Design an enzyme around this catalytic site. Sequence first.
Site, PDB file in Angstrom:
ATOM      1  N   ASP A 158       0.702  -1.336   0.461  1.00 42.23           N
ATOM      2  CA  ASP A 158      -0.175   0.504  -0.102  1.00 42.23           C
ATOM      3  C   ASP A 158       0.840   0.901   0.061  1.00 42.23           C
ATOM      4  O   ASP A 158       1.966   1.149   0.959  1.00 42.23           O
ATOM      5  CB  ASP A 158      -0.608   0.395   1.049  1.00 42.23           C
ATOM      6  CG  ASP A 158      -1.777   1.205   1.099  1.00 42.23           C
ATOM      7  OD1 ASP A 158      -3.079   1.059   0.613  1.00 42.23           O
ATOM      8  OD2 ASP A 158      -1.309   2.394   1.969  1.00 42.23           O
ATOM      9  N   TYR A 197       3.108  10.133   0.884  1.00 43.96           N
ATOM     10  CA  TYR A 197       4.286   9.351   1.449  1.00 43.96           C
ATOM     11  C   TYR A 197       5.374   9.560   0.903  1.00 43.96           C
ATOM     12  O   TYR A 197       6.515   9.799   1.754  1.00 43.96           O
ATOM     13  CB  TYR A 197       4.350   8.351   1.837  1.00 43.96           C
ATOM     14  CG  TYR A 197       2.695   7.466   1.943  1.00 43.96           C
ATOM     15  CD1 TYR A 197       1.312   8.262   2.557  1.00 43.96           C
ATOM     16  CD2 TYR A 197       2.599   5.927   1.645  1.00 43.96           C
ATOM     17  CE1 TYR A 197       0.584   7.410   3.085  1.00 43.96           C
ATOM     18  CE2 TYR A 197       0.983   5.759   2.581  1.00 43.96           C
ATOM     19  CZ  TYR A 197       0.398   6.565   2.806  1.00 43.96           C
ATOM     20  OH  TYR A 197      -1.425   5.933   3.233  1.00 43.96           O
ATOM     21  N   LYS A 251      -2.320   5.916  -4.343  1.00 45.59           N
ATOM     22  CA  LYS A 251      -3.794   6.762  -4.032  1.00 45.59           C
ATOM     23  C   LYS A 251      -3.704   8.336  -4.317  1.00 45.59           C
ATOM     24  O   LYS A 251      -2.586   8.820  -4.500  1.00 45.59           O
ATOM     25  CB  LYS A 251      -3.960   7.481  -2.384  1.00 45.59           C
ATOM     26  CG  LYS A 251      -3.723   5.690  -1.389  1.00 45.59           C
ATOM     27  CD  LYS A 251      -4.112   5.984  -0.116  1.00 45.59           C
ATOM     28  CE  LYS A 251      -3.865   4.328   0.449  1.00 45.59           C
ATOM     29  NZ  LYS A 251      -2.314   4.318   0.527  1.00 45.59           N
ATOM     30  N   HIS A 299      -8.235   9.296  -2.322  1.00 45.75           N
ATOM     31  CA  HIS A 299      -6.995   9.449  -1.326  1.00 45.75           C
ATOM     32  C   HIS A 299      -7.682   9.668   0.128  1.00 45.75           C
ATOM     33  O   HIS A 299      -8.285   9.440   1.748  1.00 45.75           O
ATOM     34  CB  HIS A 299      -6.020  10.225  -0.402  1.00 45.75           C
ATOM     35  CG  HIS A 299      -4.970   9.277   0.448  1.00 45.75           C
ATOM     36  ND1 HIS A 299      -3.764   9.434   0.185  1.00 45.75           N
ATOM     37  CD2 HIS A 299      -5.012   9.526   1.508  1.00 45.75           C
ATOM     38  CE1 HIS A 299      -2.876   8.919   1.143  1.00 45.75           C
ATOM     39  NE2 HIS A 299      -4.052   8.958   2.338  1.00 45.75           N
TER      40      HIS A 299
HETATM   41  N1  LIG Z   1      -6.047   5.839   3.343  1.00 50.70           N
HETATM   42  C1  LIG Z   1      -5.402   6.176   4.130  1.00 50.70           C
HETATM   43  O1  LIG Z   1      -6.224   8.029   4.420  1.00 50.70           O
HETATM   44  C2  LIG Z   1      -4.398   5.715   5.476  1.00 50.70           C
HETATM   45  C3  LIG Z   1      -4.330   6.705   6.595  1.00 50.70           C
HETATM   46  C4  LIG Z   1      -3.096   5.717   7.585  1.00 50.70           C
HETATM   47  C5  LIG Z   1      -2.149   4.439   6.951  1.00 50.70           C
HETATM   48  N2  LIG Z   1      -2.784   4.399   6.079  1.00 50.70           N
HETATM   49  C6  LIG Z   1      -2.146   2.971   5.679  1.00 50.70           C
HETATM   50  O2  LIG Z   1      -2.212   1.876   6.153  1.00 50.70           O
HETATM   51  C7  LIG Z   1      -0.836   1.254   6.593  1.00 50.70           C
HETATM   52  C8  LIG Z   1      -1.025   1.277   8.004  1.00 50.70           C
HETATM   53  O3  LIG Z   1      -1.250   2.346   9.108  1.00 50.70           O
HETATM   54  P1  LIG Z   1      -0.240   2.330  10.311  1.00 50.70           P
HETATM   55  O4  LIG Z   1       0.955   3.749   9.406  1.00 50.70           O
HETATM   56  O5  LIG Z   1      -0.865   4.553  10.553  1.00 50.70           O
HETATM   57  O6  LIG Z   1      -0.269   2.164  11.208  1.00 50.70           O
HETATM   58  P2  LIG Z   1      -0.110   0.768  11.708  1.00 50.70           P
HETATM   59  O7  LIG Z   1       0.430  -0.502  10.705  1.00 50.70           O
HETATM   60  O8  LIG Z   1      -1.433   0.362  12.757  1.00 50.70           O
HETATM   61  O9  LIG Z   1       1.266   0.806  12.574  1.00 50.70           O
HETATM   62  C9  LIG Z   1       2.914   1.101  12.582  1.00 50.70           C
HETATM   63  C10 LIG Z   1       3.425   1.777  13.796  1.00 50.70           C
HETATM   64  O10 LIG Z   1       3.341   0.151  14.546  1.00 50.70           O
HETATM   65  C11 LIG Z   1       5.002  -0.551  14.286  1.00 50.70           C
HETATM   66  N3  LIG Z   1       4.432  -1.979  14.450  1.00 50.70           N
HETATM   67  C12 LIG Z   1       4.228  -2.531  13.262  1.00 50.70           C
HETATM   68  N4  LIG Z   1       4.463  -3.634  13.274  1.00 50.70           N
HETATM   69  C13 LIG Z   1       4.290  -3.582  14.619  1.00 50.70           C
HETATM   70  C14 LIG Z   1       4.480  -5.213  15.558  1.00 50.70           C
HETATM   71  N5  LIG Z   1       4.394  -6.338  14.950  1.00 50.70           N
HETATM   72  N6  LIG Z   1       5.103  -4.785  17.054  1.00 50.70           N
HETATM   73  C15 LIG Z   1       4.822  -3.601  18.036  1.00 50.70           C
HETATM   74  N7  LIG Z   1       5.520  -2.520  17.122  1.00 50.70           N
HETATM   75  C16 LIG Z   1       4.755  -2.978  15.296  1.00 50.70           C
HETATM   76  C17 LIG Z   1       5.206   0.253  13.794  1.00 50.70           C
HETATM   77  O11 LIG Z   1       6.456   0.496  14.223  1.00 50.70           O
HETATM   78  P3  LIG Z   1       7.762   0.320  12.944  1.00 50.70           P
HETATM   79  O12 LIG Z   1       7.760   0.408  11.510  1.00 50.70           O
HETATM   80  O13 LIG Z   1       9.151   1.464  13.506  1.00 50.70           O
HETATM   81  O14 LIG Z   1       8.441  -0.724  13.033  1.00 50.70           O
HETATM   82  C18 LIG Z   1       4.908   1.690  13.595  1.00 50.70           C
HETATM   83  O15 LIG Z   1       5.520   2.358  14.488  1.00 50.70           O
HETATM   84  C19 LIG Z   1      -0.096   2.581   6.344  1.00 50.70           C
HETATM   85  O16 LIG Z   1       1.746   2.390   6.189  1.00 50.70           O
HETATM   86  C20 LIG Z   1      -0.915   3.347   5.512  1.00 50.70           C
HETATM   87  O17 LIG Z   1       0.018   2.438   4.070  1.00 50.70           O
HETATM   88  C21 LIG Z   1      -3.965   4.661   5.048  1.00 50.70           C
HETATM   89  C1  LIG Z   2       0.169  16.497   9.278  1.00 49.36           C
HETATM   90  O1  LIG Z   2      -1.403  16.488  10.077  1.00 49.36           O
HETATM   91  C2  LIG Z   2      -2.013  16.362   9.239  1.00 49.36           C
HETATM   92  C3  LIG Z   2      -2.794  17.582   8.767  1.00 49.36           C
HETATM   93 BR1  LIG Z   2      -2.281  18.967   9.729  1.00 49.36          BR
HETATM   94  C4  LIG Z   2      -3.749  17.523   7.648  1.00 49.36           C
HETATM   95 BR2  LIG Z   2      -3.968  19.111   7.275  1.00 49.36          BR
HETATM   96  C5  LIG Z   2      -3.501  17.134   7.004  1.00 49.36           C
HETATM   97 BR3  LIG Z   2      -5.056  16.978   5.247  1.00 49.36          BR
HETATM   98  C6  LIG Z   2      -3.375  15.893   6.987  1.00 49.36           C
HETATM   99 BR4  LIG Z   2      -4.010  14.410   6.195  1.00 49.36          BR
HETATM  100  C7  LIG Z   2      -2.706  15.272   8.123  1.00 49.36           C
HETATM  101  C8  LIG Z   2      -1.953  13.832   8.213  1.00 49.36           C
HETATM  102  N1  LIG Z   2      -1.451  12.796   7.676  1.00 49.36           N
HETATM  103  C9  LIG Z   2      -0.813  13.239   6.911  1.00 49.36           C
HETATM  104  O2  LIG Z   2      -0.150  14.882   7.300  1.00 49.36           O
HETATM  105  C10 LIG Z   2      -0.074  12.114   5.839  1.00 49.36           C
HETATM  106  C11 LIG Z   2      -0.488  10.795   5.559  1.00 49.36           C
HETATM  107  N2  LIG Z   2      -1.576  11.567   6.565  1.00 49.36           N
HETATM  108  C12 LIG Z   2      -2.235   9.429   6.522  1.00 49.36           C
HETATM  109  C13 LIG Z   2      -2.897   9.298   4.805  1.00 49.36           C
HETATM  110  O3  LIG Z   2      -3.583   9.625   5.051  1.00 49.36           O
HETATM  111  O4  LIG Z   2      -2.482   8.914   4.879  1.00 49.36           O
HETATM  112  C14 LIG Z   2      -2.187  11.865   7.871  1.00 49.36           C
HETATM  113  O5  LIG Z   2      -3.264  11.319   8.218  1.00 49.36           O
END
Ligand SMILES: NC(=O)c1ccc[n+]([C@@H]2O[C@H](COP(=O)([O-])OP(=O)(O)OC[C@H]3O[C@@H](n4cnc5c(N)ncnc54)[C@H](OP(=O)(O)O)[C@@H]3O)[C@@H](O)[C@H]2O)c1
Ligand SMILES: COc1c(Br)c(Br)c(Br)c(Br)c1Cn1c(=O)ccn(CC(=O)O)c1=O
Length: 316
Positions: free
Chosen positions: A44, A49, A78, A111
Amino acid sequence: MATFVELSTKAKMPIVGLGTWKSPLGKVKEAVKVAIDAGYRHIDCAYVYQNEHEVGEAIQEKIQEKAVKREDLFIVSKLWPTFFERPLVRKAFEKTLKDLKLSYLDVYLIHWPQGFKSGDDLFPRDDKGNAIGGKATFLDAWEAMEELVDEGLVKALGVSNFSHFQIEKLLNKPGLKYKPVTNQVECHPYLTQEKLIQYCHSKGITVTAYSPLGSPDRPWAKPEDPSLLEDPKIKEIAAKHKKTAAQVLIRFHIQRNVIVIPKSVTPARIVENIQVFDFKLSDEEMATILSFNRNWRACNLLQSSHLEDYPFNAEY
Ligand SMILES: NC(=O)c1ccc[n+]([C@@H]2O[C@H](COP(=O)([O-])OP(=O)(O)OC[C@H]3O[C@@H](n4cnc5c(N)ncnc54)[C@H](OP(=O)(O)O)[C@@H]3O)[C@@H](O)[C@H]2O)c1
Ligand SMILES: COc1c(Br)c(Br)c(Br)c(Br)c1Cn1c(=O)ccn(CC(=O)O)c1=O
């Protein structure tokens, strides 16, 4: 080797993928390499990013070394809402595709549903830090994205952070060419998304769970915010299976037929996070985890609540 969730297009989307938000340059390449080695096929990504060029390098490496074939990878990116204007959808997509060094994307997502001020300021904000809107809508974006599918540059389209009202708006748009194959939203035991998942599944739309570990690294995290990984009741279920809390949090979604994309750049954790096909949470354990729902969002984006298509005001 992850199992799959079948999309409405009949494509098979691997049920566990690697997240890449905040994966630093100098670690994200190795992260992707380790993931592919460990059996990950779904990655993803996103324009916002600003690391897609390094993800691209890792993917190209593994392909040219016969570790994996392109057809077996499932690559998602996205479109960022500063690019909802028709000409900008193409330009933004082209940058994403060139960075990833690919000939096509498996899925391309909107996104966020709210349009922001158009251009290359990715986070246009006022003095208070509130997002500045743009007049181009997600429907405008979708129109331009449909071209990419016509041209074979994208196999399927989807949405992210959409409420059921917004998905309805999309599905009921007169003259729609392609339907969303997934809605990627935050989902975990504190935000179980029961109504939204029910809705999406009823429309032939899968759900992709983001922040499944509660995104503990998020910048705006406060010490009083709930922590899924340290939750004693989650840890209890993990202990019952001699697994980690992370593995339970991931397996939770798999058993609801929801795709899940945990992020890590730590090799040991990347491996750990996909070792979730050798145990099963019981019916009672699933129910217990479901009861933890608090409607709590790690990703609330309150800075944009004033704009028209704010998705989180609706119940679902
Ligand atoms: N569409 C959207 O708006 C949106 C928003 C947020 C996220 N996303 C996507 O979803 C993905 C995952 O969500 P997220 O990155 O917000 O958070 P997450 O996957 O819930 O958590 C990631 C964090 O947990 C740690 N971690 C990973 N595996 C672990 C384990 N087995 N044990 C303990 N800690 C662990 C990682 O550390 P390390 O990396 O240091 O190992 C990182 O700091 C994102 O990377 C992104 O691709 C999309
Ligand atoms: C850092 O705080 C803000 C502010 Br302020 C604004 Br405005 C926006 Br839009 C977002 Br999406 C964030 C958070 N944020 C990012 O900046 C980048 C990625 N993401 C996750 C995603 O959409 O995948 C955020 O939530």
